[PDB]
């Protein structure tokens, strides 16, 4: 019956969910719990590099607020 | 860590393709009133693995007349390109965020054809030549309108970036504004993946097998692996461009899962069509496209240049 | 990729059947005929039986005639399913083949139930038939027939109006009426291009002159027209099967001349003369009076004929088989002028050629 | 147990892979081709056992020689058999191929395909029924199962 | 030409649609209130820096502070 | 009696509704959608396949399969060297070499059937006047080696012993027709 | 560096699969197996001889149309202009000229394959 | 990375050298595909993007049509590769070594000049607008729709006339 088709489709669905979820999780993990800052313009690149120098750890995701 | 992300993006995609093969066989069987693979492992799950092991354990032919360099290079290029094209796709966060992602997709897809062309020419066999020069016409057909269709749809997106389409479709599918284009794009994907009703480069009935006639074993298996990965890829591109999933910055998992659902739907529709329709002739395909889609496609591109102006709805840049 | 010349090379499946037959009695040659057109078996052996009956100057019994017409129609359905579905499979469409081969299997079940073999029955024998229909076979035939129409209509809803199919067939393999007649075409290769000819109507055999059935004729003369013609022929075959089922008569099944057809086993076991007849029939065989004839039937493909020459022995002197498709595959070149390789692949299907018959 | 146990299970795996996906070749010569079609038909779906037809001899596994093999056709049959890639098998189906069959005493018939190519399974009949052919294919699968190439290599 | 147009509509619908859409693509931009606003919006978008200009004491319209009433106002864009 | 299968009849009928219907047909792919619907309808129907190894399909009593030689209830080979079976076998697969017995009886000492030459036609089982040679229900006797398909009197008689029940049933249920 | 890394990884994966496919299987090479394929019979002629292309005209026309595609692909950034009227007029002229060229070729039978 | 751009340019030179040696048109097309890819990469590394991708696209299309033409007209019973002809092979190696030696010679005679292998990669990019936004080459190219409409007019006319010219040459 058509139900017997659906095991393979379920395997597919899992195998195609993993890419996106894994990418999001790993991007968040490796960018300080925040999604990767996209640099689609020199302005964004400059902002990221300023954060990199300001943080003092050479990391753009590490954020210094009013305290600094 | 980036390597771990690469693994998570490759291995699942390859497995999904492996089981696309099984799903195709079972769906076709059921639609044709038979059951399909269901004896090799529970419910036939192990059929793709058995097939891959057999193909990679069979002797790879090296026919005397062939040109070894190209005859070996082409399958590698096919699989490499099909896998690479999965790189920039947002789901919702692309592994690689490219500003001109759409042009990158077009470049990679276009270079894909050279796998078929070179393999066919290198086989040094008459059926190989037939297949290669049919693929040439297939490209001459789809490539003219694919670029225009993408231009027209992106004329509501404002930039070639894929990720921008996530926001574009925040409150609505792009299908509704451009359903006329969605259909032409769907047929163009059907042609590009070289699948029925447009599987004329490997049509068993006319050419014993096309470009891949002289290929055997693992070198052969690479071609089919790339073919099915490309099916999944193109339907993913359709799902992202049209039929936009639900994106909320709070949960990317929703986007991922909804995208999976829609991509499976379209991939199933590919096999649905394969089992439902005959095969175009390789001049009828070119006639179809050039004399039906292109006249309409140019008009639609004109109209979608006009729309942002006379509706004062220019897409934002950035 | 345009076909500038077609040179059909055949003989790759020629096994000298015409010479082999000359060495075997008239009963011992019948199985060959079931293999000349392995797709439509009972019609070939019907041609043989009619020829041998003509020479013997004997007449089949009424029940045998009706049974032969019924199973001839079933065989015509089998042939048309094979032609249409293989043609579609080669053109591209694949599902109708699987859909229809289930019904082919059911018809094979009928074949086996009556004759003990799913094909190559050897059921039709000069004189009538080997055995009478096992009880219930008419009921099963009714159950199958009442439903086959819906399955053919599904295949039609798939193929008839599809633009892809119409583009892939229409105005392909166009053959003019005069050219076809000159080339020697037959059957649908003739009726497709407007020629009003069908031996079952013009020169009836068996009981084809008591059952009403129309003869589809095409106007354009192309592959699409001939595909429609074959489908309509299947429908008319269903019509004829209905009439045969309703008018199946009672009585014997094989000519009651024990010097031609074997006597029943009980008679063999309790009658001296009957035992002698059994012995000589299954050793020496009948002695067909000297003569010559050319019997023709409207086989599911075309005009299957046998030119049989007998010199009074129990073995034929010469048995030329006129296969319907010989002239067709001869006219392939004329049909394929100015067509691509794909069009040619389409053209070969319309001919509906079985190289068993082509090679003989 | 021992490393040779690893070898034994490894060729078990090889045999499983080869037997569970033997792609035949489209090579219907005569009547018996119709019965092979009926094999593929829904009722006895050969696909269910992993069996799928592929036209390319370079991409086929088993050759199902089905029908009369005439002298004219013999060179082509041998050519394609030679062209098939190595781990290849040959199943003869029908009397025409098993032996001469109805045309044994004929000038233009190869009295059996064993003369031209080595035969691994014979399927009797005329035609052999599709159920019989499926049973024969399963028997070929058993033959593959009992292989032991790698164990032979180790004990070499 | 009613007859030829009616026939074309059925026997070559693709070209009828294409020519009609092209004709509309030309006609509509001229016939539409909103067309003027596209160039105004693209001029409103401030990609570069607004360079201050030295106040010679006789510049009466340009403001001194961004929040002063004088100067261009994007109320029209806000409620387009 | 003939019926046109594809003759175009009345042509002048052009209408606005007809034209928009035709344009919709061409542009929207109506007939293609309909074919797709048919395929799905089949998708949702019970398959017609059968798990063959544990579910053989039907076969009638007339089915012709592997040969066998029957015995009388006393246990005696019915084969009386008729020789008609050998005379009638169209493919000439039967070979009989018979000699008188020590009991003053007619029997066969070499009964060979070449099952790579037989055409499974039933002429032997119908020309046997004592119902010795029969074609039993078995249809699965594929062998790996050719020489195992050249049968002999022994193998035939053991097949008869093995299948005597089913052969008996088929003959019982069919003899009235024969 | 990420794009280079991932593309090289894809290349290496494909090449590794090929090498495994060529060094794992047991082989037997002989002339009849190696000789080319042509439906079971020997090649009547080599496949390197000229093969007429019946769509040469459309093939060339593809070149020019693809360059038109190139000329049009800047439109997404063009629309971010201030001279919207000029951009509209120019794009309309370009596409209309494209359409006229295609229409002339069609009416002149350019797209009909050459026999 | 220091040698990134120089390596890409050298690969471009080698691909162009192969094309100049002129093997069979199939290998010529393959070589030009590789050269077009490398050139696109050089443009990308020089801050470009749209231009590199456009060259790659148009060149893929062009070589597709060219290959189709070669299989039909520019063909031989035994196509000659780079290695097949011993003269081609020898001059391929000679050209490679000659370019290497010429690089060394120019570096030695002019320590800083056309080539500065020492200090290589120190002058790839000169200036960048750090805090800009609209600096993408697509903008410059799209300028043809506003400030350089004459360019568009001439190019569009060229393609239009190309249609008629090609049809009448192939008549
Ligand atoms: C790309 C490079 C193009 C620019 C010129 C290259 C100069 C160096 C080439 C060295 C000589 C290679 C040769 O002789 O050709 C032999 C081969 C033809 O060999 P063959 O077909 O005659 O078979 C050889 C058989 N044996 C082994 C028995 C001798 O052609 C090539 O090498 C070109 C292959 C392409 C290499 C580039 C891969 C890029 C990836 C795809 C994009
Ligand atoms: C995820 C699915 C895709 C996976 C693709 C990769 C497939 C991986 C398969 C794993 C099994 C690995 C063993 C494969 C052996 C296949 C070739 C073979 O059987 O050779 C036997 C050979 C046979 O040994 P032999 O050489 O002595 O046999 C006799 C040789 N002749 C005929 C010449 C006399 O044994 C080996 O040496 C193979 C070593 C394999 C390690
Ligand atoms: C068997 C043979 C196999 C051959 C495989 C060949 C695969 C080729 C795949 C098709 C590539 C064609 C398109 C050109 C390369 C990609 C161009 C691109 O997308 O942009 C590259 C990107 C620079 O631009 P971007 O980052 O998007 O925007 C700037 C702000 N971030 O960032 C970059 O600069 C990265 C540039 C490198 C791109 C990949 C190079 C792969 C080289 C493989 C050898
Ligand atoms: C408000 C102001 C603005 C108004 C603007 C109005 C715009 C209206 C636009 C309406 C037109 C919609 C676009 C339709 C594109 C189809 C083009 C066409 O007309 O059909 C061509 C062809 C039919 O074949 P043929 O008969 O030869 O047509 C030419 C006859 N001389 O058709 C074909 O190619 C069919 C052959 C290929 C079949 C492929 C199989 C597809 C199976 C069905 C897919 C259905 C789902 C597609 C959607 C996917 C979405 C992801
Ligand atoms: S064995 Fe019998 S059924 Fe099979 S091809 Fe030969 S004659 Fe036909
Ligand atoms: S098989 Fe029958 S006819 Fe033949 S010898 Fe035996 S008993 Fe007599
Ligand atoms: S079934 Fe026919 S061919 Fe076979 S042994 Fe009996 S008589 Fe001979």
UniProtKB/Swiss-Prot annotation, chain A:
> Mainly resides where?
mitochondrion
Q: What keywords would UniProt list here? A: Electron transport, Membrane, Mitochondrion, Mitochondrion inner membrane, Respiratory chain, Transmembrane, Transmembrane helix, Transport
Task: State the annotated membrane topology for this chain.
Answer: Single-pass membrane protein
Q: How does it assemble?
A: Complex I is composed of 45 different subunits.
**Which family is it part of?**
Belongs to the complex I NDUFA1 subunit family.
Query: What role does it play?
Result: Accessory subunit of the mitochondrial membrane respiratory chain NADH dehydrogenase (Complex I), that is believed not to be involved in catalysis. Complex I functions in the transfer of electrons from NADH to the respiratory chain. The immediate electron acceptor for the enzyme is believed to be ubiquinone.
Q: What name does the UniProt record give this protein? A: NADH dehydrogenase [ubiquinone] 1 alpha subcomplex subunit 1
From Swiss-Prot, chain C:
Instruction: Give the disruption phenotype, in one or two sentences.
Output: Knockout mice show early perinatal death and major defects in the CNS, compromising especially the postnatal development of dorsal cortex, corpus callosum, hippocampus and cerebellum. Neonatal neurogenesis and gliogenesis are deeply impaired.
Primary location class: mitochondrion
Q: Does the keyword Protein biosynthesis apply?
A: no
PTM field: Dimethylation at Arg-15 by NDUFAF7 takes place after NDUFS2 assembles into the complex I, leading to stabilize the early intermediate complex.
Q: Where in the cell does this protein reside?
A: Mitochondrion inner membrane
From the UniProt record, list the reaction(s) this protein catalyses: a ubiquinone + NADH + 5 H(+)(in) = a ubiquinol + NAD(+) + 4 H(+)(out)
Query: Which parts of the sequence carry Symmetric dimethylarginine?
Result: 15
Q: What is its EC number?
A: 7.1.1.2
Q: Which cofactor does it need?
A: [4Fe-4S] cluster
User: Which BP terms from GO are recorded?
Assistant: aerobic respiration; cellular response to oxygen levels; gliogenesis; mitochondrial electron transport, NADH to ubiquinone; mitochondrial respiratory chain complex I assembly; neural precursor cell proliferation; neurogenesis; proton motive force-driven mitochondrial ATP synthesis
The answer to whether the entry has keyword Cytoplasm is no
Question: Which protein family is named in the record?
Answer: Belongs to the complex I 49 kDa subunit family.
Q: Subunit comment for this entry? A: Core subunit of respiratory chain NADH dehydrogenase (Complex I) which is composed of 45 different subunits. Component of the iron-sulfur (IP) fragment of the enzyme. Interacts with NDUFAF3. Interacts with NDUFAF7. Interacts with CERS2.
Please identify the protein, giving its name as recorded.
NADH dehydrogenase [ubiquinone] iron-sulfur protein 2, mitochondrial
Provenance organism: Mus musculus
Query: What stretch of the whole protein does this chain cover?
Result: 104 to 463 of 463
Curated annotation (Swiss-Prot), chain G:
GO MF, one example: NADH dehydrogenase (ubiquinone) activity
Residue stretches spanning the membrane: 3-23, 55-75, 86-106
Q: Which domain of life is it from?
A: Eukaryota
Report the EC code(s) recorded for this entry.
Answer: 7.1.1.2
Q: What do the Gene Ontology cellular component annotations say?
A: mitochondrial inner membrane; mitochondrion; respiratory chain complex I
Gene Ontology terms describing biological process: aerobic respiration; cellular response to glucocorticoid stimulus; mitochondrial electron transport, NADH to ubiquinone; proton motive force-driven mitochondrial ATP synthesis; response to light intensity; response to oxidative stress
| Pfam families in the cross-refs | Oxidored_q4
Q: How does it sit in the membrane?
A: Multi-pass membrane protein
Reaction catalysis annotation: a ubiquinone + NADH + 5 H(+)(in) = a ubiquinol + NAD(+) + 4 H(+)(out)
Output the InterPro entries linked to this UniProt entry. NADH_UbQ/plastoQ_OxRdtase_su3 (IPR000440), NDAH_ubi_oxred_su3_sf (IPR038430)
Chief site of localization = mitochondrion
Top-level enzyme category: translocase
Subcellular location(s): the record lists: Mitochondrion inner membrane
Question: Mind listing the UniProt keywords for this protein, alphabetically?
Answer: Electron transport, Membrane, Mitochondrion, Mitochondrion inner membrane, NAD, Respiratory chain, Translocase, Transmembrane, Transmembrane helix, Transport, Ubiquinone
Q: What does this protein do?
A: Core subunit of the mitochondrial membrane respiratory chain NADH dehydrogenase (Complex I) which catalyzes electron transfer from NADH through the respiratory chain, using ubiquinone as an electron acceptor. Essential for the catalytic activity of complex I.
Can you tell me which family this protein belongs to? Answer: Belongs to the complex I subunit 3 family.
**Subunit structure, as described in the record:** Core subunit of respiratory chain NADH dehydrogenase (Complex I) which is composed of 45 different subunits. Interacts with TMEM186. Interacts with TMEM242.
Curated annotation (Swiss-Prot), chain H:
* UniProt-annotated location(s): Mitochondrion inner membrane
| Keywords of this entry | Electron transport, Membrane, Mitochondrion, Mitochondrion inner membrane, NAD, Respiratory chain, Translocase, Transmembrane, Transmembrane helix, Transport, Ubiquinone
Q: Does the keyword ATP-binding apply?
A: no
One Gene Ontology cellular component annotation? mitochondrion
Membrane topology value: Multi-pass membrane protein
- Reactions it catalyzes: a ubiquinone + NADH + 5 H(+)(in) = a ubiquinol + NAD(+) + 4 H(+)(out)
| Source domain of life | Eukaryota
**What sort of enzyme, by top EC class, is this?**
translocase
GO biological process annotation, one example: response to hydrogen peroxide
EC code: 7.1.1.2
Please give the Gene Ontology molecular function terms for this protein: NADH dehydrogenase (ubiquinone) activity
Locate the transmembrane regions by residue number: 1-21, 38-58, 86-106, 147-167
Instruction: Return the similarity comment.
Output: Belongs to the complex I subunit 6 family.
Function recorded in the entry: Core subunit of the mitochondrial membrane respiratory chain NADH dehydrogenase (Complex I) which catalyzes electron transfer from NADH through the respiratory chain, using ubiquinone as an electron acceptor. Essential for the catalytic activity and assembly of complex I.
User: Subunit composition?
Assistant: Core subunit of respiratory chain NADH dehydrogenase (Complex I) which is composed of 45 different subunits.
Q: What is this protein called?
A: NADH-ubiquinone oxidoreductase chain 6
The lineage is: Eukaryota, Metazoa, Chordata, Craniata, Vertebrata
């Amino acid at each position: 019956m058509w139900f017997e088709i659906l095991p393979g489709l379920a395997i597919m669905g899992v195998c195609l969910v993993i890419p996106g979820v894994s990418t999001a999780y790993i991007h968040k993990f490796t960018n300080g719990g925040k999604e990767k800052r996209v640099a689609r313009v020199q302005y964004q690149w400059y902002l990221m590099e300023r954060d990199r120098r300001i943080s003092g750890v050479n990391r753009y995701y590490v954020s210094k607020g009013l305290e600094n | 860590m980036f390597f771990i992300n690469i693994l998570t993006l490759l291995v699942p995609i390859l497995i999904a393709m492996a089981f696309l093969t099984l799903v195709e066989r079972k769906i076709l069987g059921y639609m044709q009133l038979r059951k399909g693979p269901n004896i090799v492992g529970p419910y036939g799950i192990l059929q793709p693995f058995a097939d891959a092991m057999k193909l990679f354990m069979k002797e790879p032919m090296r026919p005397l007349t062939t040109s070894m360099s190209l005859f070996i290079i082409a399958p590698t290029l096919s699989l490499t390109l099909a896998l690479s094209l999965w790189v920039p796709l947002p789901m919702p966060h692309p592994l690689i965020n490219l500003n001109l992602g759409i042009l990158f997709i077009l470049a990679t897809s276009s270079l894909s054809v050279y796998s078929i062309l070179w393999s066919g020419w290198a086989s040094n066999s008459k059926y190989s030549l037939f297949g290669a020069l049919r693929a040439v016409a297939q490209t001459i057909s789809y490539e003219v309108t694919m670029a225009i269709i993408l231009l027209s749809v992106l004329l509501m997106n404002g930039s070639y970036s894929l990720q921008t389409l996530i926001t574009t479709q925040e409150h609505m599918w792009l299908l509704l504004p451009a359903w006329p284009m969605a259909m032409m794009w769907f047929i163009s994907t059907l042609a590009e993946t070289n699948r029925a009703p447009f599987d004329l480069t490997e049509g068993e009935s006319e050419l014993v097998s096309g470009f891949n006639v002289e290929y055997a074993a693992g070198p052969f298996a690479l071609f089919f692996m790339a073919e099915y990965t490309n099916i999944i890829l193109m339907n993913a591109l359709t799902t992202i461009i049209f039929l936009g999933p639900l994106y909320y910055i709070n949960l990317p998992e929703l986007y991922s899962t909804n995208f999976m659902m829609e991509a499976l739907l379209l991939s199933s529709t590919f096999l649905w069509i394969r089992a439902s329709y005959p095969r175009f002739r390789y001049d009828q395909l070119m006639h179809l496209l050039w004399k039906n889609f292109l006249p309409l496609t140019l008009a639609l591109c004109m109209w979608h240049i006009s729309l942002p102006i006379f509706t004062a709805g220019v897409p934002p840049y950035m | 990729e345009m076909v500038r010349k077609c040179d059909p090379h055949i003989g790759l499946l020629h096994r000298g059947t015409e010479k082999l037959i000359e060495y075997k009695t008239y009963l011992q040659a019948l199985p060959y005929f079931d293999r000349l057109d392995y797709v439509s078996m009972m019609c070939n052996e019907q041609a043989y039986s009619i020829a041998v009956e003509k020479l013997l100057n004997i007449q089949p019994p009424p029940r045998a005639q009706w049974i032969r017409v019924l199973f001839g129609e079933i065989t015509r359905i089998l042939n048309h399913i094979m032609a249409v579905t293989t043609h579609a499979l080669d053109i591209g469409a694949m599902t109708p083949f699987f859909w229809m081969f289930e019904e082919r299997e059911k018809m094979f079940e009928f074949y086996e139930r009556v004759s003990g073999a799913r094909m190559h029955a050897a059921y039709i024998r000069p004189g009538g038939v080997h055995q009478d229909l096992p009880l219930g076979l008419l009921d099963d035939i009714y159950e199958f027939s009442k439903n086959f129409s819906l399955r053919i209509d599904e295949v039609e809803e798939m193929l008839t109006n599809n633009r892809i199919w119409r583009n892939r067939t229409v105005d392909i393999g166009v053959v003019t009426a005069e050219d076809a007649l000159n080339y020697g075409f037959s059957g649908v290769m003739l009726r497709g291009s407007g020629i009003q000819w069908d031996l079952r109507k013009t020169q009836p055999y068996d009981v084809y002159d008591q059952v009403e059935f129309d003869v589809p004729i095409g106007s354009r003369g192309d592959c699409y027209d001939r595909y429609l013609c074959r489908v309509e022929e299947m429908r008319q075959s269903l019509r004829i099967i209905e009439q045969c089922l309703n008018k199946m008569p009672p009585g014997e099944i094989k000519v009651d001349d024990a010097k031609v057809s074997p006597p029943k086993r009980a008679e063999m076991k309790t009658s001296m003369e009957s035992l002698i007849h059994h012995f000589k029939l299954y050793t020496e065989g009948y002695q067909v009076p000297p003569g010559a004839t050319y019997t023709a039937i409207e086989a599911p493909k075309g005009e299957f004929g046998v030119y049989l020459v007998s010199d009074g022995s129990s073995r034929p002197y010469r048995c030329k088989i006129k296969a319907p498709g010989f002239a067709h595959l001869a006219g392939l070149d004329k049909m394929s002028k100015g067509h691509m390789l794909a069009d040619v692949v389409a053209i070969i299907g319309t001919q509906d050629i079985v190289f068993g018959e082509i090679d003989r | 147990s021992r490393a040779e146990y690893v070898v034994t299970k490894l060729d078990d795996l090889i045999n499983w892979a080869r037997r569970s996906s033997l792609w035949p070749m489209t090579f219907g010569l005569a009547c018996c081709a119709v019965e092979m079609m009926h094999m593929a038909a829904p009722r006895y779906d050969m696909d269910r056992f992993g069996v799928v037809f592929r036209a390319s001899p370079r991409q086929a596994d088993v050759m199902i020689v089905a029908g009369t093999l005439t002298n004219k056709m013999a060179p082509a049959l041998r050519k394609v058999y030679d062209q098939m890639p190595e781990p290849r098998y040959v199943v003869s189906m029908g009397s025409c191929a098993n032996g001469g069959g109805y045309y044994h005493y004929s000038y233009s018939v190869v009295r059996g395909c064993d003369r031209i190519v080595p035969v691994d399974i014979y399927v009797p009949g005329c035609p052999p029924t599709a159920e019989a052919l499926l049973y024969g294919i399963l028997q070929l699968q058993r033959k593959i199962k009992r292989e032991q190439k790698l164990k032979i290599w180790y004990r070499r | 030409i009613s007859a030829f147009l009616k026939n074309a509509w059925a026997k070559e619908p693709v070209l009828v649609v294409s020519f009609s859409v092209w004709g509309l693509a030309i006609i509509m931009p001229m016939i539409s209130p909103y067309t003027k606003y596209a160039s105004m919006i693209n001029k409103a978008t401030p990609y570069n820096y607004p360079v201050p200009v030295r106040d010679d004491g006789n510049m009466p319209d340009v403001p001194s502070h961004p929040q002063d009433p004088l100067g261009p106002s994007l109320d029209w864009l806000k409620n387009l | 009696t003939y019926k046109y299968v594809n003759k175009k009849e009345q042509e002048s009928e052009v209408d606005m509704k007809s034209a928009t219907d035709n344009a919709a047909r061409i542009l929207m792919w109506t007939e293609l959608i309909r074919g797709l619907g048919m395929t799905l309808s089949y998708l949702f129907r019970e398959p017609a396949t059968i798990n063959y190894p544990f579910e053989k399909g039907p076969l009638s009593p007339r089915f012709r399969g592997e040969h066998a030689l029957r015995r009388y209830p006393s246990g005696e080979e019915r084969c009386i060297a008729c020789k008609l079976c050998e005379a009638i076998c169209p493919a000439q697969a039967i070979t009989i070499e018979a000699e008188p017995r020590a009991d003053g009886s007619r029997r066969t000492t070499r009964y060979d059937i070449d099952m790579t030459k037989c055409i499974y036609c039933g002429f032997c089982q119908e020309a046997c006047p004592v119902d010795a040679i029969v074609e039993g229900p078995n249809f699965e006797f594929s062998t790996e080696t050719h020489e195992e398909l050249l049968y002999n009197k022994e193998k035939l008689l053991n097949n008869g012993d093995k299948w005597e029940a089913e052969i008996a049933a088929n003959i019982q249920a069919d003899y009235l027709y024969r | 560096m990420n794009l280079y890394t991932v593309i090289f990884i894809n290349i290496l994966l494909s090449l590794t699969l090929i090498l495994v496919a060529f060094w794992l299987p047991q082989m037997n090479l002989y002339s009849e197996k190696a000789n080319p394929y042509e439906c079971g019979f020997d090649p009547t002629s080599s496949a390197r001889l000229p093969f007429s292309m019946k769509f040469f005209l459309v093939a060339i026309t593809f070149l020019l149309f693809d360059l038109e595609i190139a000329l049009l692909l800047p439109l997404p950034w063009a629309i971010q202009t201030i001279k919207t009227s000029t951009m509209m007029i120019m794009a309309f002229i370009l596409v209309t000229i494209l359409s006229l060229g295609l229409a002339y070729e069609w009416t002149q039978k350019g797209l009909e394959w050459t026999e | 990375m220091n040698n990134y751009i120089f390596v890409l340019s050298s690969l471009f030179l080698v691909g162009c050298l192969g094309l100049a040696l002129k093997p069979s048109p199939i290998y010529g097309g393959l070589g030009l595909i590789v050269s077009g890819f490398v050139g696109c990469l050089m443009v990308l590394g020089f801050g470009g993007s749209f231009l590199g991708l456009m060259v790659f696209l148009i060149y893929l299309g062009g070589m597709l049509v060219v290959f189709g033409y070669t299989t039909a007209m520019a063909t031989e019973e035994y196509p000659e590769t780079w290695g097949s002809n011993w003269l081609i092979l020898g001059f391929l190696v000679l050209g490679v070594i000659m370019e290497v030696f010429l690089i060394c010679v120019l570096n030695y005679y002019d320590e800083v000049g056309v080539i500065n292998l020492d200090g290589l990669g120190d002058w790839l990019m000169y200036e960048v607008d750090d805090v800009g936004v609209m600096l993408e080459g697509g903008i410059g190219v799209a300028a043809m729709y506003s400030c350089a409409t004459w360019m568009m007019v001439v190019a569009g006319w060229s393609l239009f006339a190309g249609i008629f010219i090609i049809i009448e040459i192939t008549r």
